[PDB]
Symmetry: D2
Subunit: 395 residues, 4 copies
């Protein structure tokens, strides 16, 4: 008995029966280092949206989902730290724990788990074949390495809405803020008010930023951010970002900027916001970040976009105003979040009431049968982070 | 009075009589903090070549040169640590010493010395109208802050050909290597076998790199790099860069990469290399740097190139394969070198024979009258670094 | 007309007429780089107390005070950035701005301003003879480099009780926390609930620490810390520090520990707390900081203490259980805070209401005539930070 | 079929027959993650000497040796990257690869492999009861995480004298130098011309230091250091170290200082050097390191020393002149080397002839039966590093 969300072509996902998990890798070799989880909570990601919209090279039939929190039901013979019944947060990265990059804390780019390229992840295009976890049950390989044990079940269940964000979005937003150099007193600009943008804004606040400005083209997502105490920039109005920031800060620049949009970026302005223009965020962040600043880029950029705007963009080439960044001495930091690097201290923050992440990103808890509908609302721009409770454990 | 190298329009320089330096800034306000130097040695740079070629917005009449070594002949009334006769290395950055960026060692982007933008330099486009120093005498403002005191004059003069590199190219090459993450045992690729690239190679050697490979489309420069003990990759051949690297290393990746080419980049291959393609280096570096690696970009890129290949490149926009670097978790480091942050320890290294920079870059000493001829030769691609001795002090 | 707080021997200070400041250094040479301030607010520090208790080699007649906020009334001819009437925060460190340590942001240890050793500061033993500023007027040398310009007078004056802490204690407490490695999610122990200890605790809250525990032997300072939302360890109880921490956290250790006591440390327990044992804090921090942790030590330790417990301590030797910290792989960070490294970002934090520093440290505003009484109360251990308003400008 | 070096009480070691390795931990539990090695080379360490001299709480019967290079002859059933015949470097830390410290690269203080405290190592006091490897065969647990693969056996054995240093002393010396802040152009002082000190000196050279001065009380070691091209300081002479340094550099300070002596430190001077004084090195490093400088302390300090000079030292407590370090703003870095952090890039530098470590540390190859003789000669202070070749594979 297993089931989950399956990708079936542009705009299409459905809940299907799927195989119960097996203690083997995606090439069918047996493994001793894995566990099988009964899934407690499992979220929908903006990355999942890229795939569902037909924006990647994903195969039809892909089981989706890489934001898992779970409870051990089966343990492979080599696993030392796990017991049946243990609650765990699963980092979205599949990492081996023994290669050059895993050992150097670069668990987003594991050298062994994916025959095609460095880096692995559950239910995710080009990520080594590991089955996704928007499902009733899921296999986690290298369990001793990857898993974050949650505190006593009671206190954990009590904050599950928060803890479900440790799998992907909070550590990601956090990595965005830290690589952009955010610290106490920083002025911060955040591109994107989606779940990831909002997590970067929360992270920046937690890191002690003086002021945090969140930008989007979506007015409902900005209203959400504003109700959460952040400053906003509306990129659908005709007033340029520079001008919006200056009205707020008294200069047209920030200390730190985070790109939480990626390759489906829209342009700015009345008509610009209705046009896809994937270099937009990059170019505008070079424009607003002060000299010697750092740009953090958690937003996803791909080597291949079948639906992209032009030949160059189909192959991940953007028209980027690099001379500007260079003239401003900017440095840029990119790539999949190494979730494990931050997830334990972020847990401490949640448990100690330092960060109300669930309120901030607008967590909504849904049934597994509502998942397709959840994707639909998410696609239609709702200011929410959808959390699937597939066994009805806490809803 | 004084005389020096003057730019007269695309491809034209000549030595002219010019005013003796005055104790005032480019706005004509008196300064108490400056010194006037008799110029001992003064170098020709690839940056100078960009301007001479008419590839920047540099005006006719500009006095050239930002790589100065001198002797103090006059000091302003507020200068406390400099005395007459003192022999000094001058960082190419003009920096104030008291703004936010100068305090934080970002002295390539001083916020007060330039009304146009952050950052200053001598005889350099968009760099605040500080007068160039390919000349007999030159003004250095903020002398206590900027100047590097050279060792008792005998010892200094005997290593003049080396120390003349401290003003620009050695610290610049060094910046590129350290921001690319080079250290003991690193494998390193450097694009560009011009003097800056050779300084980057020298720096990586100093740092204890396991192996250093220098790439260029100009075979006579690669011959020179090879005779200095470096590995080479010839981009004018049709053999792809990753294949030349694998033949040297046994894998197609380096740990660290440095872009010492900048915006006049040629394409790769027999015919590709005969044509300008400004994004080529950046794209190639993402291709051969290993995941989670760092890319150092000392090479110059501009916000405006009058003679660029395309409308986009005229504005500093390049077709960059960003999605590739993003998928490899690359980080990118850019901009004008903070020369002061490294010049002291590099001088130490020079004085203790840990680095034979003059040999590595191919230093050649010339008379001031020979400057126009030297620019011609350098522009034609000879494997040399031209050092002007305007008062015939050591030649 | 000038007057200040003067040190007159163990336990003794009085307010005296003193010379109006002069544009010369402590050796009587004219300087062009200084300003004179009309003092707006000027604070009493724990460092001042060491000196008043006769615990240092401070000479009788020392004019005290290194915590200055002021209004420019005079300007030396070399000064570029200052105007009469400007409101400024004065970092307690006297720094030149052009030596090796000043350039690398080590402005607590300037090489040029003190003939006796590295590092200068106002009204401070062994700190170069710069006159103190617990006075109506004071000289600030190297004004362009050292001074922090405050916001429109009106907004600045309104937050004076907060901003006055930028001269010394907030940056210091901050340096304590950052060098101890504090970050989002940290568990933090801070030794000392004095104004500096409190600033460290505030800094740790601002840095996003999960839980902050402040320890002291003083019951009244702890009741004040507890009112400000911090956890407490009462070292006057017989319950050892381990046990109090473990009761609080469920393990007898913290990620990060800051020493905000210094060389007049008391031992632990009913009677231990009435004994001086200068090694106490260092040894107990090594006991409760987890493996590979960092210990930040802002608390002052001296080369000479005329009033110490024994021979060894009079020369700054302590019996330190180094083997313990070594076995735990601890790192240690020490010395005068480089205030300029942090003050600007801290000002932004204050102006944006991210840190209510005045309330936390218990700012109390007094007249210059009440200063001796202030010293008295401070010495008796009141949980307050004394701020003198010498011209009655805001009180 | 196995034997090795067994400790029998103060001053006494002998070769005995010992059990063949079993695939279990020191508690007798079965493990699937280990491999068994035929030992190729296995070294004698100063750490071993501490124990043999009776200066630790090490038990009679302890099998010695933590510096192993070997070939895999048997693999556990869960091992994924090791094959029989594989030739490997063993880091001396026993590390699990799944706990908090292991993941953060703090593999010197693993939290799971040792019931007594954090940190594990082979045949080493308080290090988890993992059996030592000056033996014919040895167990390495967590093989996929811990082992460093060496290349074609042929190229590897030709450099075996160098390669055998990667297990312990080269990465130790390297850790000491990097944490002392050593970089291109650094001036460095290293206390101790034992093998570890010599490896720090080699490291500092590799890292590009301007000048490296090694001190010792043992002149036969200093003769060796000088022959290896380093500067020396003789601490058995009455000339104070700061004067010896000034003679060499023209100032009495260094940029970086490394303590490669540890808890059996001798005093300085004709008579001082003849007596044990365990605070001596730490105290003199604070004396000669420049302000804001960093002190690396790879030398061992213990929480309990049975034969220490006084009551306090038996407990790991030293009379440290901390006031002086504090006034100079020193940082201090301590503890067991995380060998995995550095071993990969040091192997690269060895294979590409960037460091001739075996020559520098004075490697001498001996039989297993001659081990007691090696220990004796090493204790008499010869300038050599003993490498045991148990199966006569390359001697
Ligand atoms: N590095 C990582 O680990 C990582 C992890 C998850 C997601 N991501 C990427 O981060 C992005 C965030 O996902 P999300 O969860 O935020 O999904 P999302 O797609 O809902 O959020 C993207 C937001 O960007 C907005 N936007 C579009 N153009 C914009 C512009 N010009 N300026 C500002 N905002 C603009 C969209 O309206 C949307 O609100 C996704 O692209 C995701 O792929 C990266
Ligand atoms: N960051 C700084 O502060 C700083 C300082 C000085 C110079 N620079 C910049 O560094 C760059 C180099 O200066 P230089 O004196 O070394 O320049 P240079 O003009 O002598 O040489 C540049 C080299 O790049 C080579 N090249 C062109 N396309 C190439 C490709 N695709 N691959 C490999 N090589 C290619 C050319 O053959 C040439 O040999 C210049 O652009 C200069 O403006 C920056
Ligand atoms: N590094 C710097 O730049 C710098 C700057 C300012 C102050 N300091 C030093 O920091 C310390 C803090 O200064 P302050 O203004 O808070 O002075 P303070 O003397 O009021 O603070 C010291 C506090 O520590 C308490 N204490 C004594 N023994 C203790 C122990 N074992 N554990 C915990 N607490 C103990 C005392 O009760 C007192 O409350 C002083 O030493 C000051 O000199 C250093
Ligand atoms: N950090 C680690 O993980 C690690 C690893 C290996 C060894 N160690 C420790 O490193 C130390 C040295 O390594 P080794 O094997 O070369 O040690 P060793 O004992 O062979 O040599 C120590 C040297 O220091 C000299 N010495 C003694 N007092 C001195 C003083 N006051 N000043 C200068 N030199 C003095 C001794 O004569 C001897 O030459 C030992 O303490 C060892 O326990 C630590
Ligand atoms: Zn995701
Ligand atoms: Zn891996
Ligand atoms: Zn140049
Ligand atoms: Zn400046
Ligand atoms: Zn103070
Ligand atoms: Zn200074
Ligand atoms: Zn050892
Ligand atoms: Zn471990």
């Amino acid at each position: 008995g297993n089931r989950g969300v399956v990708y079936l072509g542009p705009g299409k996902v459905e809940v299907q029966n799927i195989p119960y998990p097996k203690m083997q890798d995606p090439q069918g070799r047996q493994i001793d280092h894995g566990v099988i989880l009964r899934v407690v909570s499992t979220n929908i990601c903006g990355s999942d949206q890229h795939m569902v919209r037909g924006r990647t090279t994903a195969p039809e039939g892909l089981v989706l989902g890489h934001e898992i929190t779970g409870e051990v039901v089966e343990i492979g013979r080599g696993v030392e730290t796990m017991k049946i019944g243990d609650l765990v947060s699963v980092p979205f990265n599949v990492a081996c724990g023994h290669c050059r990059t895993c050992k150097e804390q670069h668990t987003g780019v594991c050298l062994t788990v994916n025959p095609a390229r460095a880096g692995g992840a559950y239910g995710y295009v080009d990520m080594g074949g590991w089955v996704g976890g928007q499902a009733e049950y899921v296999l986690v390989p290298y369990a001793d390495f990857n898993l974050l044990k949650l505190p006593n079940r009671e206190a954990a269940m009590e904050k599950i809405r928060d803890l479900t964000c440790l799998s992907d979005i909070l550590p990601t937003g956090y990595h965005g803020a830290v690589t952009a150099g955010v610290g106490p007193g920083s002025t911060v600009y955040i591109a994107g008010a989606g779940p990831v943008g909002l997590a970067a804004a929360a992270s920046a606040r937690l890191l002690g930023a003086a002021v945090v400005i969140v930008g989007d083209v979506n007015p409902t997502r900005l209203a959400h951010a504003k109700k959460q105490g952040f400053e906003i920039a509306d990129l659908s109005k005709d007033t340029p970002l520079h001008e919006q920031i200056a009205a707020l800060l008294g200069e047209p620049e920030v200390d730190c900027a985070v790109d939480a949009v990626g390759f489906e970026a829209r342009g700015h302005g009345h008509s610009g916001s209705q046009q896809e223009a994937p270099a937009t965020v990059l170019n505008s962040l070079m424009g607003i970040t002060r000299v010697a600043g750092k740009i953090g880029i958690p937003g996803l950029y791909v080597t291949e976009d079948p639906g992209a705007v032009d030949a160059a963009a189909k192959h991940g080439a953007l028209s980027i105003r690099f001379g500007l960044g260079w003239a401003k001495s900017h440095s840029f930091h990119t790539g999949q979040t190494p979730v494990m690097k931050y997830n334990r201290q972020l847990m401490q923050a949640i448990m100690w009431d330092r960060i109300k992440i669930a309120d901030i990103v607008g967590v909504e808890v849904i049934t597994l049968d509502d998942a397709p509908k959840g994707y639909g609302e998410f696609d239609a721009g709702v200011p929410k982070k959808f959390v699937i409770d597939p066994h009805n454990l806490f809803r």
